[PDB]
Structure 1
Amino acid sequence: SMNPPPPETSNPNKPKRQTNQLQYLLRVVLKTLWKHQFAWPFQQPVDAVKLNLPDYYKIIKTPMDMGTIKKRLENNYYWNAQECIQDFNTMFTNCYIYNKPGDDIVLMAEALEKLFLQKINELPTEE
């Protein structure tokens, strides 16, 4: 009945690189989903204490959110765009694992997921 610590977002021992796929992911992909009307429940880790969700982290063992993804992006944590995408894909799937199909938070996730997929359907070819 406590929050876990957040996922790792910095590690200086990890190699850094700037590519156009990571920049796209931040500048286009994360911007877009961040400012979307449904983004608000996903901009930080599920606060299972504040939200009164003791069982959240009894069911979700691989948590992820768009704030952790920002901190990862901005902190040059990712080497591969697919590491980012998987994180976005964990975010959604966690929502679908925890919540009841068809409620509101799942509907919210499904439209953000459709926005995400579209943008990723034409991520930049590596320059």
Structure 2
Amino acid sequence: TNQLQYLHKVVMKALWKHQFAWPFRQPVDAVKLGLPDYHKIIKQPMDMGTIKRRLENNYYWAASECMQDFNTMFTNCYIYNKPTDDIVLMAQTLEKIFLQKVASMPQE
């Protein structure tokens, strides 16, 4: 669909290459990052790599389904991390771009 094309060619394109994107390009690895409570707190992990694969593989049935996955990724970050953690500011920066681009997405 045209909305999913826009989410891939415009939204994901902008977010994937952003200088703050690197912590979000793959699933949170609780072992690598030393976060033994991560999966106790966050029950629906999400990341941009997964979203990008789903767009590439025509996994989504609706634009809002992809938008919900972006939202879950950012919301997980705000719920799990401390308010003062730098990753929170990175997520906020990327979410602002997501919303600005989504404001001009096609309607169908």
Would you say same fold, with TM above 0.5? yes
Q: State the Cα distance separating 1:51 from its structure 2 match.
A: 1.0
Distance across 2 between alignment mates of 1:115 and 1:20: 20
Match of 1:46 among 18, 28, 32: 28
Q: How much does 1:49 deviate?
A: 1.0
CA distance in 2, matches of 1:94, 1:82: 18
Q: What does residue range 91-110 of structure 1 map to in structure 2 within 5 Å?
A: 91-110=73-92
TM-score (norm 2): 0.97
Give the aligned length: 108
Q: What CA distance in whole angstroms lies between the structure 1 residues aligned with 2:67 and 2:46?
A: 11
Unaligned stretches of 5+ residues in structure 1: 1-18
- CA-based RMSD of the aligned residues comes to 0.7
Structure-2 separation of matches of 1:102 and 1:115:
21
Percent of matched pairs sharing the same residue = 81
The residue aligned with 1:66 is: 48
* Separation of aligned partners in 2, 1:21 and 1:102: 35
The structure carrying a bigger helix percent of its residues is: 2
Show the counterpart of 1:116: 98
Query: TM-score, normalization: structure 1?
Result: 0.83
Q: Deviations over 1:61-112 (max 9, x none)?
A: 0110000001111110001000000000000000000001132100000010
Amino acid at match of 1:33: L
What corresponds to 2:8 in structure 1?
Answer: 26
